[PDB]
Amino acid sequence: MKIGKTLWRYALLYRKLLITAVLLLTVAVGAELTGPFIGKKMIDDHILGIEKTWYEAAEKDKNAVQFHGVSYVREDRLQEPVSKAKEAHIYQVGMAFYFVDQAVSFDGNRTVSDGKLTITNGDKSRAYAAEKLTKQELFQFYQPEIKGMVLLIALYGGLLVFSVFFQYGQHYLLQMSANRIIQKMRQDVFSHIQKMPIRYFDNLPAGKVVARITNDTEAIRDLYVTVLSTFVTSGIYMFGIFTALFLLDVKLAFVALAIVPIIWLWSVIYRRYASYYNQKIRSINSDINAKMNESIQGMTIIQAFRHQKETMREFEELNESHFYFQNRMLNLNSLMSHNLVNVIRNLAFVALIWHFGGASLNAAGIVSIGVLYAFVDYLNRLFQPITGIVNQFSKLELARVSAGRVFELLEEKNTEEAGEPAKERALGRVEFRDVSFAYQEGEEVLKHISFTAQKGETVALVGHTGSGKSSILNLLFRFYDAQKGDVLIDGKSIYNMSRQELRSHMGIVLQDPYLFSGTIGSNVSLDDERMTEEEIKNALRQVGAEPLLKKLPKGINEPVIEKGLSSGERQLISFARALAFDPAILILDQATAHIDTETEAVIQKALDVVKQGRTTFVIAHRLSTIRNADQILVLDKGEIVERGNHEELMALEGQYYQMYELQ
Amino acid sequence: FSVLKKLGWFFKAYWLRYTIAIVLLLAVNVIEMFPPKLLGNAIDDMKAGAFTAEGLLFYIGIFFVLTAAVYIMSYFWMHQLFGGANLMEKILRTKLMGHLLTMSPPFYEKNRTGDLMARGTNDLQAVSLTTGFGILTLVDSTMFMMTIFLTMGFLISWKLTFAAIIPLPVMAIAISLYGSKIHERFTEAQNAFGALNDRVLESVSGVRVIRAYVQETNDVRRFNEMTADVYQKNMKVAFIDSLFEPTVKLLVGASYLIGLGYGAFLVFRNELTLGELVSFNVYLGMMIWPMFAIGELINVMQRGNASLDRVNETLSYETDVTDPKQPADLKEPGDIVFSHVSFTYPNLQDISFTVRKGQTVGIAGKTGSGKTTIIKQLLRQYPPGEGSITFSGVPIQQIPLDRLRGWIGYVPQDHLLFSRTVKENILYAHFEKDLHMLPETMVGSGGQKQRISIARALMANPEILILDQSLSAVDAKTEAAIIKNIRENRKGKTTFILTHRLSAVEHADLILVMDGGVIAERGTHQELLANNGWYREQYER
Ligand SMILES: CCCCCCCC/C=C/CCCCCCCC(=O)O[C@@H](COC(=O)CCCCCCCCCCCCCCC)COP(=O)([O-])OCC[N+](C)(C)C
Ligand SMILES: CCCCCCCC/C=C\CCCCCCCC(=O)O[C@@H](COC(=O)CCCCCCCCCCCCCCC)COP(=O)([O-])OCC[N+](C)(C)C
Ligand SMILES: Nc1ncnc2c1ncn2[C@@H]1O[C@H](COP(=O)(O)OP(=O)(O)OP(=O)(O)O)[C@@H](O)[C@H]1O
Ligand SMILES: Nc1ncnc2c1ncn2[C@@H]1O[C@H](COP(=O)(O)OP(=O)(O)OP(=O)(O)O)[C@@H](O)[C@H]1O
């Protein structure tokens, strides 16, 4: 089993949104990256276009610039080509611009002494006259390009607004995708939780499972957002920028491409050390919180003993290590993060300057400052997301383990497959036959528990702790399987039917009335969605006094906005639910170790209302309020020590006498 | 003073590393403005005729040294300014829980433990983040903005600067407005997710009932509805969240476009160069961070003002009595005499009784009557009432706390164990047999743990041993043996047995039966036989 394989298989769902987002992001990235390419053109061809040769031509009007004498036209803007014609240049020396009205054979170092521009470059090609371009003249030679200056600018502007939309959508789409996947995930998880054996929740706490449902799936949501909004976007932005660099230049693009291994090694070592430095602060802060919590509820005991001042010792023993590893993480951050980003950025400036100077002005030519500017912008865009990339790469492991946890929950095969209800009332003829139930292995807890409760209700099971009284309830609802013997209802084997069918015959009023958050009416109905008016009837029949206090319990009355009130009223609601659902068989796993005063009196008044007309199992331990039971059974050692009526055990003495002797 | 000193006492004694850090930070701020201008100058020198190998070598050397300087200065100053955050975290933890310990439980344990545990993490993190990150944001949003503004307003132009800068105030205000609502709509998602979590917990605890009445499909139908609501809230938040990157992209591309277009226009009027254009664009590139830094600054300085008021209220405003009063004291606690004590909880009414050195005494009574209030007051954990509790003759308050708590050997009815191993719980009784039984293993059987508490209290070899319902878990034979053994060992020592069973708290020395708000009588076991009908030996075989 691989976490990534199932993550990909889950991403394949909702693939339409993912493809839409990926393509929108790709086009937005391309549109944006085309901006610095527009800037390069708008610099090199317009601002730096003056350097191109000029020809004496008043013919191409509306674009032929006018000197103090004749009018001139650019080389590539020559709409009526005249070939050589009259060669002229506009050279730059320091800040001054100088017009040369004659052909030039070489370019290089430019020197002006007395209006005689000299270009030698160690060759002394010639000496040429010159004229200072003044100020208005320089502007006149710049006006022809102004229109283009505007045009490309608008283009830039346009794309920007364009990209904005194509930048919004994709992100939003990605969000939906991830979230929806999580939703899917959650559903499946919960579904699989309703197919889980009760053993699962018996050998596991509620907090763990709820965390494995919600918090883990939130971690997986963050994992998907990390993978998509960071790695995919960053990779697309790298591919586009590198492509643009390769179109601009090759060798400089080879230098820029030489940084990917740098990011690889940076990320590798940063993760290798940050795993240490972050595990050893998460664990230590967990220890810190555990120590602080274990030493706050004992403010009455820690104070009144010799440890009010000894807690500091072992705490600080932990805390100095916590702070030491915090500082170690700070050191690792200092040797990386924005610092290495800026180091690489300055190295990139050095690479640009070195390449251009050594390969362009060593030969005294082939300089494109538009390429320089585009490279500068491209590398500024490139060097933004490296820190986030490395941070997320380091963080990925906790999301990996959480996804693995959810996959293990979603993957194990030991589950119960059922869902079929019943279609009749069983009449409560439950029978047992030498059931030999073992919980873990070899250590049997029930020893041939054989009996047959007739339609006559109140087969009380009062016995010893650690005997199997609760095992009876567990096997009755098939929460566990006996692994031997047999159980029947009207002669039908329990282990040859469906669990939902079986539990559709029998109800339960547990010792702890479960008061699900919400309205009392739904609570008693347990949100059945199949009873409408019987709920209020079956409640008022016994707790008719309670509605007299405030509003209507069915009418969204809310005394249960704190997971409830009086425990008697709490057990009364449980009784009302059991009656409304109206099972054939009825089990009362009543455990009242601390009876709440005389409130139990009405509780008994409720019991007699429900126990009648059924097959009731009262797993009590009072042996006084159940003296009318049709068949008392006493359970010790895991075997039925004694059985009989309320009076047949008094004559025979035995375990029932032993317990009732502690009257 | 005010919000300054409220955290300033931390680096008031640490000014060295909280001033060298500022100095190095400002030095880096100024020096970082060089590389762009040097790049522009290199461009302009390449364009002009004058350029040799010496200029290239000189430029690469200066760039290298500037890189190394910024790399060392950052690696040191930021190291100092975040080690300061670490130290402030360590100081705030220590001080908070030191207040916790050096306190009493009358009104504090009344205060919810949730708030106390939430402080020590949430508000400590908030204040430490203030000290570090809020200061960094102050430096980079009050100076770095002004420095770059003037570097481009004096070395590039005062025209191009304002044009390329006009969109950034709009960007900042839009970011603030977006944050004003994303938080408002984040509470909705978080609390709907909390409701789904509550429902899942409620459905997973009541699994037996759910599957008993075969409602699991409804449950799954209820779980899917809430999941849909969570998703809907997440979408209502992501709608806004996806407006962040587009807006910064728009208002940074607008800045770049204004810079480039207006710079080309100015150059056409011969007011800039090309190197200046490149340098100004690099400056624009380096100006992004302050726009977010201002928002981070305002957020942290708005949060801290209250996230530190919390710690102040749970650290300083607390004023209770956890210490003794006058040097007055009795070196020996042998005899304990009460006089009209009326201790009340934050109960008794005219209670008076006596004890003596080497007296194993017992107390009993009914429910709802002051029975813990007797020994609880003797432990000095709640405000004193009327009367006097004198070991010899003088009021209780004068008795020192250290000696008193050292004298008392207490076993509580609501037993508690801290150390994770029983050995350390005893280093903090018939357990020689419990050693040869199921369990020095680990802590965290009720009777066995009560035995551990008894042994731990006895290990003090005290003079006033208080037992508060410490024998209700063990059998009658076991508790009888325990009391006999302790009385024989502690023959010349005092004991204050207290338990619901009226068998081991009558015949030792005396029984102070408590009924209602006053005493029923101050007789002994023999007199207890001839008295009002109550829980006598009738109810115990
Ligand atoms: C130009 C205007 C005209 C007026 C100029 C006046 C001078 C303007 C200067 C302004 C600079 C800033 C001063 C800050 C306050 C000083 C105290 C201080 O810093 O405390 C520090 C140590 O204490 C010192 O540093 C004292 C240094 C000077 C006196 C020692 C002799 C050196 C003389 C030098 C020769 C020059 C002086 C010669 C004088 C004859 C740290 O202590 P603390 O941690 O804060 O502890 C107290 C708070 N706590 C308990 C909460 C922790
Ligand atoms: C206006 C612009 C419109 C643009 C078009 C809009 C299209 C409509 C929008 C939504 C997409 C809808 C897809 C429906 C798929 C139906 C099932 C099927 O048979 O097809 C198969 C598709 O791949 C093949 O058909 C190739 C043959 C199968 C080889 C295995 C896949 C090879 C991946 C190389 C293929 C190129 C990979 C591209 C990577 C980015 C399913 O293969 P899969 O393994 O189960 O899942 C692959 C998912 N992936 C493709 C995302 C990787
Ligand atoms: N989750 C479990 N896993 C394994 N064995 C269990 C589990 N729950 C109970 N048992 C075992 O089942 C046997 C009987 O337990 P059961 O809960 O049925 O007792 P009980 O008679 O109802 O006791 P009590 O007086 O505590 O109500 C004992 O061996 C107990 O160890
Ligand atoms: N922590 C407390 N805070 C406030 N009042 C308290 C506290 N504990 C007890 N009381 C009150 O003290 C009054 C006197 O009886 P108390 O509850 O102290 O003793 P008890 O319950 O009879 O004894 P024991 O605690 O040994 O069972 C009762 O009315 C109870 O309300």
Numbering used by the authors:
A (entry chain D): 1 to 564, 567 to 665
B (entry chain C): 2 to 347, 353 to 434, 451 to 461, 465 to 469, 476 to 572
Anything the authors wrote about it?
Our model heterodimeric ABC exporter, BmrCD, is presumed to be associated with drug efflux in the Gram-positive bacterium Bacillus subtilis. BmrCD is a heterodimer consisting of two protomers: BmrC and BmrD. Incorporated in giant unilamellar vesicles, BmrCD can transport ethidium bromide in vitro, a process powered by ATP and inhibited by orthovanadate. Finally, a distinct feature of BmrCD sequence is the presence of an extracellular domain (ECD) that caps the TMD.
In the same dataset, we also detected IF conformations in 2D classification and 3D models. The cryo-EM maps displayed anisotropy in both OC and IF conformations. Heterogeneous refinement implemented in CryoSPARC42 was helpful in resolving the anisotropy problem of the maps for the IF and OC structures.
